[PDB]
């Protein structure tokens, strides 16, 4: 019985591979071969945010491109004013080993997650004026990898237990559970429509998930190591995934296959964070070589190099308006570029 | 500059002062990681060393030095990912029950994987061989011998500089020294002088566990100073 099922699964995989290969009429490197080059994009450190007592691991931009929240393993979440470089709020975390943070789109709540296996949502608009714990979302049998808010009431979380869940802050229960992956999920990526999201795990594959139906429709492969980062294209029809193989790949949801590959013989360090610009022309990705290289989304040419940090770049975030970019590292600094 | 901006800058300076004050407690507190298999008696040490849950924090103070010991909870066996967070720590407390001759190979493989990690290349490992009484009983009863698991036990000889304890038979001493040598064989591998293991013998009733960890942390800090302060 099981043998026939495995044979049928292998046949279906072969058919999917043949179908993806049949639709490969032309590669992206051939159509965009006549486009004008991007040149060299030089970025200088405009603001230098410091104050964290430990390594900075995660950061996220809210709706307003002026506010910024960063997560550090010291147990403190500081809201940074990118323009005045002033510390707005200080949230003393109960668990110091935090690994991710999220900023709600309304700007009223923020979430965090780490080895505590509990996603704690902090309310910033409390009438008492002090930041307190709103809800302690527990139930994940593993460390939390990444969290992202869909709206002011719903939030999706990822954990290393190979399972994802959709939480409701109103009641504090999992409304949808995803158990299709075969490895620890590392990062999430919400579409601009907030209706679909694709995530990557250590299984060297990324699967597109549905918020309502709660079922995976497409499975992307091609990586040779664990996928640590993932980011969706501004339009919402494609996404990129970073892995420790020092090779970033671009996947399209409509084509259901890879379109371009970003790699260089000089880069051998793994990828930690990947992000896109406002229009998606420039692809920024963080590497373990203490630098952050910018890649051309249409030509795969390195448009610049950011070597303003002295330690591993652990996170990367671009504002909603593309005015400035933030890069965090384990050296307890968070510098702003442009 | 408006008054609201000045008040915000004042609040930022107050937050910076609070962070500077918290630094005095963060940098002085030493963080330690507690690892071990399910059969390991690390729970007995945690319960006695008080001088869907995730990370478990255990704090104790000895000789005016605050120590923070963390134990992993429901996280899966996929260690290569979440182990990167516990880097830069003072030491990693590795407890293994040497009395279970069956699962010694798994413990040795885990110790080799931890010692040969890319990120823990500069982090020392404190080895504690817990449950020495059960090991003594098993090796003296003659029911299960170590030769049935390791073929080198029949060819190993007790070192000359081995100082046995009073009231202990030569067989128990030979067995424990063979285990210590088997562990040191993997500890010294790929050492490069950047991290050294500290084999130590302890038990569930041994109340001197806090002093051994204190001495190990002192030695590690001394070595780190000798390296950084240009003395090695």
């Amino acid at each position, epitope marked *: 019985e099981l043998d026939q099922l495995r044979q049928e699964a292998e046949q279906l995989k072969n058919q999917i591979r043949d179908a993806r290969k049949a639709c490969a009429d032309a590669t992206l490197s051939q159509i965009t071969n006549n486009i004008d080059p991007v040149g060299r994009i030089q970025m200088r450190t405009r603001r230098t945010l410091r104050g964290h007592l430990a390594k900075i691991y995660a950061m996220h931009w809210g709706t307003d491109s*002026r*506010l910024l929240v960063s997560a550090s393993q010291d147990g403190k979440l500081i809201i940074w*004013d990118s323009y*005045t470089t*002033n510390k*707005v*709020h200080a949230i003393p975390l109960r668990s110091s080993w935090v690994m991710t943070c999220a900023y709600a789109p309304s*700007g009223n709540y923020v979430a965090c997650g780490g080895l505590d296996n509990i996603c704690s949502i902090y309310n910033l*608009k409390t*009438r*008492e*004026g*002090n930041v307190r714990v709103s809800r302690e979302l527990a139930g994940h049998t593993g460390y939390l990898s990444c969290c992202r808010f869909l709206d002011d009431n719903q939030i999706v979380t990822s954990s290393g237990d190979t399972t994802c869940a959709l939480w409701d802050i109103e009641t504090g229960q999992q409304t949808t559970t995803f158990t299709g992956h075969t490895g620890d999920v590392m990062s999430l990526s919400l579409a601009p429509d907030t209706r679909l999201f694709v995530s990557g795990a250590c299984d060297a594959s990324a699967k597109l998930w549905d918020v309502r139906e709660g079922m995976c429709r497409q499975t992307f492969t091609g990586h040779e190591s664990d996928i640590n980062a993932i980011c969706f294209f501004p339009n919402g029809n494609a996404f990129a995934t970073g892995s420790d193989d020092a090779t970033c790949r671009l996947f399209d949801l409509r084509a259901d296959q890879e379109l371009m590959t970003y790699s260089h013989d000089n880069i051998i360090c793994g990828i930690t964070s990947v992000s896109f610009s406002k229009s998606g022309r420039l692809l920024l990705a963080g590497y373990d070589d203490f630098n952050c290289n910018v890649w051309d989304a249409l030509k795969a040419d390195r448009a610049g190099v950011l070597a303003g940090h002295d330690n591993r770049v652990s996170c990367l975030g671009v504002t909603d308006d593309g005015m400035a970019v933030a890069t965090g590292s384990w050296d307890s600094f968070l510098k702003i570029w442009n | 500059l*408006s*008054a*609201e*901006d*000045k*008040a*915000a800058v*004042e*609040r930022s300076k*107050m937050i910076e002062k609070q962070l500077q004050k918290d630094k005095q407690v963060y940098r002085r507190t030493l963080r330690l990681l507690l690892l071990g298999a399910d059969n390991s008696g690390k729970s007995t040490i945690v319960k006695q060393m008080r001088i869907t849950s995730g990370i478990f924090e255990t704090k104790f103070q000895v000789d005016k030095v605050n120590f923070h010991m963390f134990d992993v909870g429901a996280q899966r066996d996929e260690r290569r990912k979440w182990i990167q967070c516990f880097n830069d720590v003072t030491a990693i407390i590795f407890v293994v029950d040497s009395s279970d001759y069956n699962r010694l190979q798994e413990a040795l493989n885990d110790f080799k994987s931890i010692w040969n990690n890319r990120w823990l290349r500069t982090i020392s490992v404190i080895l504690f061989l817990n449950k020495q009484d059960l090991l003594a009983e098993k090796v003296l009863a003659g029911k299960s011998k170590i030769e049935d698991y390791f073929p080198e036990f029949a060819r190993y000889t007790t070192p000359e500089d081995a100082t046995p304890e009073p009231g202990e038979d030569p067989r128990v001493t030979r067995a424990k020294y063979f285990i210590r040598k088997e562990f040191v064989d993997i500890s010294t591998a790929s050492g490069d002088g950047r991290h050294i293991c500290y084999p130590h013998f302890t038990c569930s009733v041994d109340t001197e566990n806090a002093r051994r960890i204190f001495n190990d942390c002192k030695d590690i800090i001394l070595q780190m100073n000798l390296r950084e302060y240009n003395l090695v």
Partner: single-chain antibody
Amino acid sequence: VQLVESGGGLVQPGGSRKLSCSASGFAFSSFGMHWVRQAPEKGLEWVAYISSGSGTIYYADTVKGRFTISRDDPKNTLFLQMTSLRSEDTAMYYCVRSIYYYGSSPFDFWGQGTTLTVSADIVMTQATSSVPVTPGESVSISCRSSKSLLHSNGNTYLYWFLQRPGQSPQLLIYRSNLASGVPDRFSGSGSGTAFTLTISRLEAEDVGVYYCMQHLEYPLTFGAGTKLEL
């Protein structure tokens, strides 16, 4: 949040009296304290200001030197040592909390206040002192300032307060931005020198006096007050 002032009474001219306010239900250490007086049948006037941790203190030109402000964060109480009282210092003082950060709403809560029956500055002016209006009709209140409140950062430091008969002032607008708890019927818009407060639809509970205030500089100055008659 609740502020209960104490220490009021009949004091002869030249005496000494210390007002005490008890804070509870919020972080008294994080919020700054303000003292605003209200003479009988008159407008509001800023007295003094103290920041968090007693790091920044300011007094008005009419009370500088005589009165001193002090706070007790451990006990969560505010003190106002009022020395050398004058015959014109008779007024009801209100204790107001405030916090300063991006997106804050200073002067959000007004205490009950206590009465003390004794015995360049941006001067605000309102051309309309009393405007009798009918219920349901859209009311529009205009304000005028002598100095442009538009700072280089682009923020407009204008505050609107509504003090109903027998109640403490309530913050309506702190910067177009609507304060928490205030219905969406209120709306504010204007230029750097001209400001207008428009009400979408007046109700029976909207009666009272509207006081304007500028926060461009430390010496806060209030307006004359526009009262609406039902």
